[PDB]
Amino acid sequence: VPPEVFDLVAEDKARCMSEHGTTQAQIDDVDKGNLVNEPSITCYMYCLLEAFSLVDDEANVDEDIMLGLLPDQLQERAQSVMGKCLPTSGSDNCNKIYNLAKCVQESAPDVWFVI
Amino acid sequence: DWVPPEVFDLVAEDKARCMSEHGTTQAQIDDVDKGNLVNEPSITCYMYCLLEAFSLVDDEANVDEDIMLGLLPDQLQERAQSVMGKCLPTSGSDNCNKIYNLAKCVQESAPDVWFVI
Ligand SMILES: CCCCNS(=O)(=O)c1ccccc1
Ligand SMILES: CCCCNS(=O)(=O)c1ccccc1
Ligand SMILES: CCCCNS(=O)(=O)c1ccccc1
Ligand SMILES: [Cl-]
Ligand SMILES: [Cl-]
Ligand SMILES: [Cl-]
Ligand SMILES: [Mg+2]
Numbered sequence: 244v245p246p247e248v249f250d251l252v253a254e255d256k257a258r259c260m261s262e263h264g265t266t267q268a269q270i271d272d273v274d275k276g277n278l279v280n281e282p283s284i285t286c287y288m289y290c291l292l293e294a295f296s297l298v299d300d301e302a303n304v305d306e307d308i309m310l311g312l313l314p315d316q317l318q319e320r321a322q323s324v325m326g327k328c329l330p331t332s333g334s335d336n337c338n339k340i341y342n343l344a345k346c347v348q349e350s351a352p353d354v355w356f357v358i
Numbered sequence: 359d360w361v362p363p364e365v366f367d368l369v370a371e372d373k374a375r376c377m378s379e380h381g382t383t384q385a386q387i388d389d390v391d392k393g394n395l396v397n398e399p400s401i402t403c404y405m406y407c408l409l410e411a412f413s414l415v416d417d418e419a420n421v422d423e424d425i426m427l428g429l430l431p432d433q434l435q436e437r438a439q440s441v442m443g444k445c446l447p448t449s450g451s452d453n454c455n456k457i458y459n460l461a462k463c464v465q466e467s468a469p470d471v472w473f474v475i
Contacts, residue, residue: 246393246465246472252369254431276363295412296425308425311413312368314375348363355363 252358259290276355278344285337288344291358302331302339312356324350368411369475376407393472395461402454405461408475419448419456434471441467 260270265287273284292298297309306325313321328346333339348355377387382404395401406415412429415421423442430438445463450456465472 244470246468246470248391248393249431249434249471249473250475251429251473252475255429258431274365276360276365294428296428308413312411314371352361353363355365356368357365358368 255291255294256358259287259294262290263287273344274357276348278341278348280338280341282337285341285344289336289340292340295358298331298340300336302333302336302343304329304331304343320351372408372411373475376404376411380404380407391474393465395458395465397455397458399454402458406454406457409457412475415448415457417453419450419453421446421448421460430473437468437471441471 256270259265260267263286264283266283269281269284270287272279273288279285289298289302292302292304293300295308295312296305297312298304304325306329309325310318310321324347327350328343331339331343333342373387376382377384380403381400383400386401387404389395390401390405395405406419409415409421410417413422413425414429423446426442427435427438441464444467445460448456448460450459
């Protein structure tokens with residue numbers, strides 16, 4: 244019998260949504276580049292980054308792992324955005340990630356990367 | 359003021375890039391997605407490329423089990439820990455063959471479980 248196939252990204256998103264009461268409409272908003280400082284979505288964003296080892300349990304970004312998501316041709320651009328936007332800051336892990344996302348959006352308004 | 363950005367799905371972009379860079383056909387990707395592998399670089403270096411794009415392995419065939427375990431779902435954690443304990447570290451004739459052998463080891467150990475981007 245063929246194996247059951249598990250879509251890792253779908254699973255990780257599902258788990259993070261369920262942990263924070265996040266709706267599909269909210270995740271679809273973030274996917275369009277529309278950001279709001281509302282914990283039900285910003286805590287989802289933190290959860291998902293943490294699942295990918297992009298941040299630790301205090302929402303500090305692991306720059307090597309974050310740069311590691313991108314192709315070689317985008318490394319210099321990404322390094323420049325990380326120079327403007329790291330280290331993270333904010334009142335809690337979720338607000339740290341809201342502030343990061345806003346900084347990344349404003350620093351590179353032409354493009355928006357999503358998992 | 360906000361302007362709509364061009365949105366890029368990392369997974370979609372990574373698959374398109376990796377396909378191009380390794381000569382992989384759509385049929386071959388479809389086979390990978392169903393768990394059917396062959397020890398041909400157009401397949402195995404494509405799989406390597408997708409893993410590397412999420413830091414699951416370096417450019418020297420070293421797999422990071424801690425990053426991997428974080429991505430797997432809760433209900434597979436115990437099985438995944440056991441399977442990866444059995445199948446790591448990698449071994450093989452070259453970078454891409456190491457990933458072929460890893461995939462085959464995981465499939466032998468857990469024939470009912472296959473994970474995809
Ligand atoms: C860059 C800051 C925005 C993060 N958005 S995200 O949480 O959906 C996410 C995107 C990509 C990988 C993991 C999580
Ligand atoms: C030039 C394109 C902007 C780069 N954005 S980013 O570095 O914040 C980034 C976003 C999501 C994942 C990894 C890095
Ligand atoms: C056992 C080795 C995994 C191979 N599967 S995959 O190439 O689709 C893949 C899964 C997860 C992330 C990236 C690529
Ligand atoms: Cl940081
Ligand atoms: Cl702070
Ligand atoms: Cl895309
Ligand atoms: Mg890399």
